[PDB]
Design a protein around this ligand. Structure first.
Ligand code: FDA
Ligand SMILES: *[C@@H]1O[C@H](CO)[C@@H](O[C@@H]2O[C@H](CO)[C@@H](O)[C@H](O)[C@H]2NC(C)=O)[C@H](O)[C@H]1NC(C)=O
Ligand code: NAG
Ligand code: NAG
Ligand code: NAG
Ligand code: NAG
Ligand code: 8G2
Ligand code: MG
Ligand code: NA
Length: 585
């Protein structure tokens, strides 16, 4: 038996395992649903991006009430490195108030100031070449970017020429250059920091930078292709776990730990381990005849993602080359693959279908004329309307406090609620960063191979549609600006210039929004128990000893940004909290 068992070898588990195994007297077992990736081009080479090699299979949503009852495929990782292995490598910190908010929901410690040292420790930033910084308008604040930590990030070493048109158009419609989107604000446009190792121009995922890097260590055990099926207890103490093969062979095995269990199975996996282990809402557990160890009705409640919209265009006069050239021009593709293989230059340094720059905006940057009308509607409506009738009152009090903090962010000029992106090809992306809508993930049985019922409940809160429609309109501004007009863009079916009203435009969005960018979070939320929280400030699950949540299940709510950089830094942080309590080197 081992000092610690970690359930899941994604960003959080692997980061924690690495730091705990720094004390050679400490032994760790990481059990991970997925295999080791085979170093295949679709993982390591940006231009080869093929996320679908390591998607969890047979995961489908309920009909989505907010999105014309559409049923969508659920995307999450099943592989050592979890999401970092298969993600678009977008490496962005939240805004200051994201972390200050978490502290103000009743979590001592938590702030931008307490998270800043861990973001720095987490990483090594490699500067781009000076000719690319100057030509690309790449800027950073060296003072707040790590130089010693394991996660490599940098930028591609190429941009598509059209990314210049987009930058100037974004500038032209109120989205200015951001000095460093990693400094706690990101109001305008910047280069996407990418989680790439610039020595090789290859993905820097948790498996390389928090396992291969330290895999010489005897005390750092990994077991790929196995599920944690249950937590094992002596009374209220978690002592070990049962594990089964992922492929569904008739085999169960108990392993035990001397100190703690850490759950790290992500937003769609950690709640399931708790519910099967009898840590969940009493009503769900009773209905299934699971003995109740800890009545926590917040387990599987409060699911959030960051919805996506793909807006199709045609161009009379698009500049060559662009991202779509890699698909349609076999010659261009081969010349750039040859150029990557030889001298590690060119289009293959960029994640396939993305560009190098991006915009983020606050509510009042998106909608300078109407943001007060949106806030008013939000402040008018009671928090309880967002949740099913019958929702536990502690869960409702928690959402109400999230909702209040999010409404202040709506008022804040320096907090993002949306992302705009153009790949330089036939589509643009608009991300809803801060939805007020709340979903569920609940086990349907006691069979640990069974999919949990996943209900995103995207667009159930009608304030989300007003925010999203503002985001859509600002994107349209960029494409209609002078610097993008010379390319002759026009919205393709089922959008178009012929949709002018909030209702015409959102009717289409309703049909097209993806509930998910696989940023599933918050389904075991770090708030007080009397506000429907599952974990304390030190990430300990309520009413049980020696069990914490490390994965982004613990987040109260979605950042102004994508989760990956906080997943790393949060795990770096929990690592110090555990070493503190049990006295390790
Ligand atoms: C395709 C795609 C693309 C993106 C992203 C995700 C995906 C799927 N994301 C999201 C981001 O990668 C994700 O939110 C983080 O990896 C979350 O880290 P965790 O440690 O919470 O989960 P993560 O998913 O990393 O780890 C959970 C692990 O637990 C395992 N598991 C589940 N149940 C288990 C069980 N019972 N037993 C054992 N193991 C179990 C899974 O196999 C998985 O590997 C992203 N973010 C970002 O910042 N930039 C981006 O560009 C993207 N893009
Ligand atoms: C990726 O991250 C690591 C961590 O900073 C870098 O590895 C260090 O590199 C220097 C010079 O190569 C060595 O002398 C150190 O011993 C290495 N490890 C450390 C400080 O932990 C690596 O340089 C980074 N990749 C890039 C492109 O810079
Ligand atoms: C979605 O299905 C439900 C039946 O459960 C029904 O109330 C509703 O009308 C449907 N909505 C749409 C827009 O199809
Ligand atoms: C860089 O910004 C300058 C304005 O400072 C502008 O002239 C140029 O077109 C921009 N190019 C890109 C690639 O963003
Ligand atoms: C697995 O094996 C045990 C004993 O060999 C038995 O209780 C059980 O029915 C088997 N299960 C399946 C699904 O075959
Ligand atoms: C295709 O790409 C090659 C290589 O860069 C280029 O010479 C050619 O002009 C392109 N052809 C078309 C039709 O885009
Ligand atoms: C800016 O691009 C992204 O954040 C992103 C793009 C594509 C995918 C994969 N479906 C995921 C994330
Ligand atoms: Mg240099
Ligand atoms: Na270069």
């Amino acid at each position: 038996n081992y000092t610690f068992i970690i359930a899941g070898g994604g960003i959080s588990g692997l980061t924690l395992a690495d730091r705990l195994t720094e004390d050679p007297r400490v032994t760790v077992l990481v059990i991970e649903a997925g295999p080791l990736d085979r170093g295949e081009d679709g993982i390591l080479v940006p231009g080869a991006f093929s996320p679908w090699l390591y998607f969890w299979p047979g995961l489908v949503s309920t009909p989505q009430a907010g999105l014309n009852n559409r049923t969508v495929d659920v995307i999450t990782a099943q592989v050592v490195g979890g999401g970092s292995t298969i993600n678009a490598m977008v490496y962005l910190r939240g805004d200051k108030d994201d972390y200050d908010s978490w502290g103000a929901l009743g979590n001592p410690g938590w702030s931008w100031n307490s998270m800043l040292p861990y973001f720095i420790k987490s990483e090594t930033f490699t500067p781009p070449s000076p000719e690319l910084a100057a030509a690309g308008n790449i800027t950073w604040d060296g003072s707040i970017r790590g130089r010693s930590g394991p996660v490599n990030y940098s930028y591609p070493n190429y941009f598509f020429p059209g990314s210049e048109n987009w930058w100037n158009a974004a500038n032209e419609v109120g989205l200015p250059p951001v000095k460093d989107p990693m400094a706690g604000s990101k109001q305008g446009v910047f280069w996407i920091p990418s989680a790439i190792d610039a020595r090789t121009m290859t993905r820097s995922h948790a498996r390389r930078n928090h396992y291969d890097r330290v895999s010489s260590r005897p005390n750092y055990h990994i077991l790929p292709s196995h599920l944690v099926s249950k937590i094992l207890f002596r009374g209220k103490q978690a002592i070990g776990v049962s594990y089964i093969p992922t492929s569904g062979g008739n085999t169960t095995t108990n392993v035990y730990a001397s100190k703690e269990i850490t759950l790290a199975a992500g937003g769609l996996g950690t709640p399931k381990i708790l519910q099967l282990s009898g840590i969940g809402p009493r009503k769900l557990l009773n209905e299934l005849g699971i003995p109740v160890i800890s009545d926590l009705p917040g387990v599987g409640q409060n699911l959030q993602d960051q919805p996506t919209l793909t807006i199709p265009y045609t161009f009379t006069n698009n500049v060559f080359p662009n991202t779509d050239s890699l698909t349609t021009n076999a010659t261009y593709n081969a010349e750039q693959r040859a150029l990557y293989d030889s001298s590690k230059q060119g289009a293959y340094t960029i994640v396939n279908s993305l560009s190098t720059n991006i915009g983020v905006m606050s509510l009042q940057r998106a909608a300078p004329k109407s943001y007060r009308q949106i806030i008013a509607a939000a402040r008018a409506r009671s928090a309880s309307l967002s949740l099913p009738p019958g929702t536990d009152p502690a869960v409702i009090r928690g959402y109400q406090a999230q909702r209040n903090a999010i409404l202040k962010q709506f008022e804040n000029p320096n907090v993002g609620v949306g992302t705009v992106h153009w790949g330089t090809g036939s589509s643009a992306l608009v991300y809803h960063l801060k939805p007020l809508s709340r979903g569920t993930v609940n086990i349907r049985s006691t069979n640990p191979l069974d999919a949990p019922e996943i209900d995103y409940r995207t667009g159930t809160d009608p304030i989300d549609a007003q925010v999203y429609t503002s985001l859509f309109r600002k994107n349209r501004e960029i494409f209609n600006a002078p610097s993008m007009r010379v390319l002759g863009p026009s919205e393709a079916a089922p959008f178009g210039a012929n949709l002018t009203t909030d209702e015409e435009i959102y009717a289409v969005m309703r049909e097209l929004i993806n509930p998910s960018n696989a940023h599933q979070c918050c389904t075991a939320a770090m708030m007080p128990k009397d506000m429907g929280g599952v974990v304390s400030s030190e990430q300990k699950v309520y009413g049980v000893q020696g069990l914490r949540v490390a994965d982004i299940s613990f987040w109260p709510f979605q950042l102004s940004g994508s989760p990956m950089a906080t997943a790393y830094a949060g795990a770096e942080r929990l690592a110090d909290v555990i070493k503190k309590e049990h006295r390790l080197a």
